[PDB]
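Hey L., structure's done. Input below.
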Amino acid sequence: AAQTNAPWGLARISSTSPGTSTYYYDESAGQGSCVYVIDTGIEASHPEFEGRAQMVKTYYYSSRDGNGHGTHCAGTVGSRTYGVAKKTQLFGVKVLDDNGSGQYSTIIAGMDFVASDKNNRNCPKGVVASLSLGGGYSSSVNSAAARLQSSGVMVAVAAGNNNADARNYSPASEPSVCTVGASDRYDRRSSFSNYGSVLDIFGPGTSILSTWIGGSTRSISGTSMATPHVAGLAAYLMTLGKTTAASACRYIADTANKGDLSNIPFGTVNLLAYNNYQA
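Output:
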């Protein structure tokens, strides 16, 4: 399939080169995979989700995404227009309040929720979690992400937007999960993107057009926006049977566009997520 005039991120993940505007992808499109978006929640009722999104868990008075960011990231994963995996099931876990903040305990709870909740969900192709969040280092947060991974969820996490070594941020610094850096459309590490040895991949992170709350759309920037590309991409790849949860990161890294990013510090991988679709 070919989505024309797609967000640049989508076109980039289906291309060897920057500067193309068409997303190419196998029409399976993540059908039968699930992605948990562990964030501020999802406006399930956005027409871009076509009934494939729902809230499954909140730790606040409401399941409603009053922030937008979880909705944005859900759209990058699997909205029909802005999504990598246009047929994936999206499950919202609202661990963040509507100001984007959450306690680590609550985040941890959410991660463990997913690890169990997936046994209540029909994801014959596999399950992904997209954690578009991060604070300072915490071994409890790291180990929660690791448990989630160990349970057979492909965990994608934002490197962080500190322009620092991601070693100092959690869950970015958990080795067992996929830590995602952000790139911009001229194939540069996004100025804000964390880096370091713990990064596994880069995805599109600068000026990412996706869904927003109030049935709208907007473009925003962040490694948090890169993460759902990788997550969507794992969902897409699992559906194609190219990989499982426990290998998906390694697979995505093995099939990435290599050496294409500039301003990648020495020691950080020069890998850009690539769907490797050949139409």
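The chain has one domain: 1-279. Residues 63 and 143 are 26 Å apart (CA to CA).

-- N.
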